Design a protein around this ligand. Structure first.
Ligand code: HEM
Ligand SMILES: CC1(C)[C@@H]2CC[C@@]1(C)C(=O)C2
Ligand SMILES: [K+]
Length: 405
């Protein structure tokens, strides 16, 4: 339903966008969010949905607000308010200065040096999964690849059993795209219920997995607390299980629908890194935000202490003011402007792992299955939330057009 309009919000700024079920969803989720960038829509609107909150609709404002942590705090970064209040992951629920010390520790477990120790295993799993599908001439891409590839890599990194994936993936999804059965607070507590014993165990008997490294880590030279380690590990799980997983499906849906972009990357494989970046712009998928720390006039709009503002990372790169013909995918685009991995002091720490997983997927899939399509008569349905995704992606191909490496 629609929350009562706060006294300070004028009627002319009301645009009742629902980030968990946007009205234009059938057009594609990016398309659905892009309604906020039609010419008649102001740069900053109020929606009465999901408890009531601001939405910045343009890259300029989104970037400004992410830079200004003084006014726009990460203490309550999710909508609805109950979710943002319960949200206590580290480093994301902290502002500078206290946030910064935790980034280095997170870098030890998901940063570039670790991508290096994983490189071969990433490559091997992608190739194995794709070769298994190749002779079938069909797959359900979400369940058959988009989930198991990044998730099994994360579970390896974290030293967690693969049989725990269904439970962990369910919990993670309630924090980003709740089905209604659990509040954010309940999902978070369930995730902590999982992690607590494991963190204890690995502080007693450290291994070399990511949970052990975090749980025994130092932050600016002093020991991390069990509490802090839990709040960091919860965030790593969510990043591992619900980011790349969704992004791969948007990318593969696009490639299934655009043979000439497939051919471009097959003919000119050196373009794959650039293609990855353009796809990250076009199929950007995250939208969280901030809470006002004080009353503040921003771009001529009165904001009040405690107001939440959604700052959709998704939207900056889709803004025509940042990229011309923004819904068009051009792998040769010269300045690919986006905030897909965030902006300001909270820039994604998992982005190198993410790019590796994306690039390996594009190369190893097109190597083996260059020619594929959406299944006959399928209409691909998206889903929206803090991280958006694809409900199902049935693909088909003729095995005769494939190549076993
Ligand atoms: C396509 C893949 C991904 C996208 C689009 C993405 C997006 C983002 C965004 C937008 C933020 C900033 C949120 C904010 O400012 O409130 C962020 C932060 C973060 N991400 Fe990523 N992410 C991805 C993959 C990953 C992965 C795979 C991991 C770990 C396995 C990860 C770990 C983190 C962490 C730890 C932060 C917190 C940084 C901080 O708060 O200081 N992300 N990500
Ligand atoms: C917004 C995010 C993508 C970023 C990493 C996981 C996520 C859901 C967060 O809670 C912070
Ligand atoms: K909070």
């Amino acid at each position: 339903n629609l929350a009562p309009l706060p006294p300070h919000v004028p009627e002319h700024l009301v645009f009742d966008f629902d980030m968990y079920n946007p009205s234009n969803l059938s057009a594609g989720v990016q398309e659905a969010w892009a309604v906020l960038q039609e010419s008649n829509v102001p740069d900053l609107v109020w929606t009465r949905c999901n408890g009531g909150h601001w939405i910045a609709t343009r890259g300029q404002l989104i970037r400004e607000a992410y830079e200004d942590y003084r006014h726009f705090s990460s203490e309550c970064p999710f909508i609805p308010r109950e979710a943002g209040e319960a949200y206590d992951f580290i480093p994301t629920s902290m502002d500078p200065p206290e946030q910064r010390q935790f980034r280095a520790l997170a870098n030890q477990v998901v940063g570039m040096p670790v991508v290096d120790k994983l490189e071969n295993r990433i490559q091997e799993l992608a190739c194995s999964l794709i070769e298994s599908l190749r002779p079938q001439g069909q797959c359900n891409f979400t369940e058959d690849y988009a989930e198991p590839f990044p998730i099994r890599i994360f579970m390896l990194l974290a030293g967690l059993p693969e049989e725990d994936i269904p439970h962990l993936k369910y919990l993670t999804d309630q924090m980003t795209r709740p089905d209604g059965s659990m509040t954010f607070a309940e999902a978070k507590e369930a995730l902590y219920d999982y992690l607590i014993p494991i963190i204890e165990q690995r502080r007693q008997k450290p291994g070399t997995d990511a949970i052990s490294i975090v749980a025994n880590g130092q932050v600016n030279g002093r020991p991390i607390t069990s509490d802090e380690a839990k709040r960091m590990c919860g965030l790593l799980l969510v990043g591992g299980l619900d980011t790349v997983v969704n992004f791969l499906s948007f990318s593969m849906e696009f490639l299934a629908k655009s043979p000439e972009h497939r051919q471009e990357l097959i003919e000119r494989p050196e373009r794959i890194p650039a293609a990855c970046e353009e796809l990250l712009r076009r199929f950007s998928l995250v939208a969280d935000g901030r809470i006002l720390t004080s009353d503040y006039e921003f771009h001529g709009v009165q904001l009040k202490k405690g107001d939440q503002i959604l700052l959709p990372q998704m939207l900056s790169g889709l803004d025509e003011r940042e990229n011309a013909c923004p819904m068009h995918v051009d792998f040769s685009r010269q300045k690919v402007s986006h905030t897909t991995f965030g902006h300001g002091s909270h820039l994604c720490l998992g982005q190198h792992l993410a790019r590796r997983e994306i690039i390996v997927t594009l190369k190893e899939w097109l190597t083996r299955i260059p020619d594929f399509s959406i299944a006959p008569g399928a209409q691909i349905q998206h889903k929206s939330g803090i991280v958006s995704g694809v409900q199902a992606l049935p693909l088909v191909w003729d095995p005769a057009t494939t190549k076993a490496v």
